[PDB]
Design a protein around this ligand. Structure first.
Ligand SMILES: NS(=O)(=O)c1ccc(C(=O)N2CCc3ccccc3C2)cc1
Ligand SMILES: [Zn+2]
Length: 258
């Protein structure tokens, strides 16, 4: 009876195994756009993905992760609110059963259809497992998805999902360019928070882009055909794998833009 997204093991249960669920810097949060303060000291975000080396895609029973070779400074995030250099390790999404929900962060209580998380670790801690033990260990770039026009750069991901339907399945996934998942603008909000899944560690500088990407209904429908279950187990569609907004508590959300 491990954690998941169901009635009996979903977000409102997580605190029993992971008491930090009720902590002081939990994610996601609602971004109140009128209360977020423009911070002229914030730098433009530097996203350097030209040499990114994707390796594999994995259904881990909660989402799918596109994994990267993070054994050298290839795909890195810096600037913005960050000090130092953060290396891309994986991206994944959260999405809904319907287009009206699925995002983890909300904007003035608006829920997007899905949310992309590009996860990076601070190179000053040497590895991901050490980084998650630190308050500045991770930088997660969050990008909202709305349903409209197709995102051509997403289609390579959508088309491999058939091969990783069920929990524990993986597939080679080389030469995928995550630049094709970015919106035009790098305007963002930022705040200190946490992982949004167990172990819910309070190790993340969140950077949430203002501009959503558009994906087609067909693209998101393919996400919703994935399974939380393993092969030859009762089919449970992988949908609604998002944690709701958590209390902001003693935090300020800062905007990079006026
Ligand atoms: N949704 S999110 O906050 O962007 C998120 C980001 C990263 C992860 C993640 O890769 N994990 C959880 C922590 C951890 C710790 C030790 C070893 C492995 C892992 C694997 C899960 C969720
Ligand atoms: Zn996530």
């Amino acid at each position: 009876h491990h954690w998941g997204y169901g009635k009996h093991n979903g977000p409102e249960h997580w605190h029993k195994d992971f008491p930090i669920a009720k902590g002081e810097r939990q994610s996601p949060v609602d971004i109140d756009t009128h209360t977020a303060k423009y911070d002229p000291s914030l730098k433009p975000l530097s996203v350097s993905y030209d040499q990114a080396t994707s390796l594999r895609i994995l259904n881990n029973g909660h989402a799918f992760n596109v994994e990267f070779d993070d054994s050298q400074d290839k795909a890195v995030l810096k600037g913005g609110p960050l000090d130092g250099t953060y290396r891309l390790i994986q991206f994944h999404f959260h999405w809904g059963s319907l287009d009206g929900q699925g995002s983890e962060h909300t904007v003035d209580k608006k829920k997007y259809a899905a949310e992309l998380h590009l996860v990076h670790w601070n190179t000053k801690y040497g590895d991901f497992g050490k980084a998650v033990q630190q308050p500045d260990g991770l930088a997660v770039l969050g990008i909202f998805l709305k349903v409209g026009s197709a995102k051509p750069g997403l289609q390579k991901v959508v088309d491999v999902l058939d091969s990783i339907k069920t929990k524990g399945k993986s597939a080679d996934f080389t030469n995928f360019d995550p630049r094709g998942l970015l919106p035009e603008s790098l305007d963002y909000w930022t705040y200190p928070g946490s992982l949004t899944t167990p172990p819910l560690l309070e190790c993340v500088t969140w950077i949430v882009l203002k501009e959503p990407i558009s994906v087609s209904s067909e693209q998101v429908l393919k996400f919703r055909k994935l399974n939380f279950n393993g092969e030859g187990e009762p089919e449970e569609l992988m949908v609604d794998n998002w944690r709701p907004a958590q209390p902001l508590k003693n935090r300020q959300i800062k905007a990079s833009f006026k």
